[PDB]
Each structure stands twice: as C-alpha cells, then as structure tokens.
C-alpha cells in the first residue's frame, strides 16, 4: 500500500454562481456551493474521502473560499487542516483568487500564508488517521499530502474561473492499496 502524496485538480468554477444569501435555506446553500469529492489512501491501505467545497467570498470579486475535510462524516475527529507550506496554525479553508482572465492567481490560507506569484500551486493538507496508534508523545497520527491546483496564469490542467458551468474536480491521485 502507498499513501497518497498528491491530488491534482482542474476544471472550472462558474464566475456567475450566486453569493450565499444571509439566512440561506437548504436549496440556497446547495445553489451557492460547488462540492467535489475524491478517494485518497493512507499508509495503512485504507481509503478516505476528500471533500472540497467551493463558494464565493462575499464582497470580493474573483475570490472563492474552499473548505476541505477528509472523511466528512467523521470530520470533527479527523481535524483536517490546510495551509501553504504548513498545516500548523491554520484552519481547514483557503481563499483562491483569480485574475481578470479567469486564470488562477493565488491561494492564501487562514494564517495569511500565500503562494508565490508564479509557478505551481500546492496546498498542504493533513488529517488524523483515526484508530491508528498515537505517536511517541501521544498526539494523534496524521497523514499529510498536497492538493495541486495547477500553474498560475494558465488554463491547462489548472483550476479556472470562467463564465461557464462549474466542472472543477480532482483528476488524479498517486496512492493505492
């Protein structure tokens, strides 16, 4: 068994999606969110569900908040965290921003850590592997891997924000059982 080390995403987020309204109902939450899921693997051979939900940042054009959880039905226990270069001092969301052409521009985590202005965009992810024996100090054992959103400034194999149907999804990961 090989633990996942990278998950690659591509495809589009519809620039025209409505912002989530104040006191949204069930149908309104669904309408304002693009939800994605994909299977990753831990080092013990077990599969986990990686869920990333995207929604526009109210009040900032070309900006979306992505909320990430491994195993949504156990998300309190997995305590997923995401960051740029780290998963310490951070929550489980990031803001992805696009330029006026619809192309990826930056990702910023909840601590303010931000991608370089050019090149590939990697978001580090970690979560507790539940049931795994804790570590030396007793802390829960975690699995870390990257989410690769593509190359800044290009549409090929990269997440985009055009005025077109939402299609963003994970296309590949590298672990297996």
UniProtKB/TrEMBL annotation:
Domain Flagellar hook protein FlgE D2: 12-176
Subcellular locations according to the entry: Bacterial flagellum basal body
Segment forming the signal sequence: none
Main function: A flexible structure which links the flagellar filament to the drive apparatus in the basal body.
Family indicated by similarity: Belongs to the flagella basal body rod proteins family.
Protein name: Flagellar hook protein FlgE
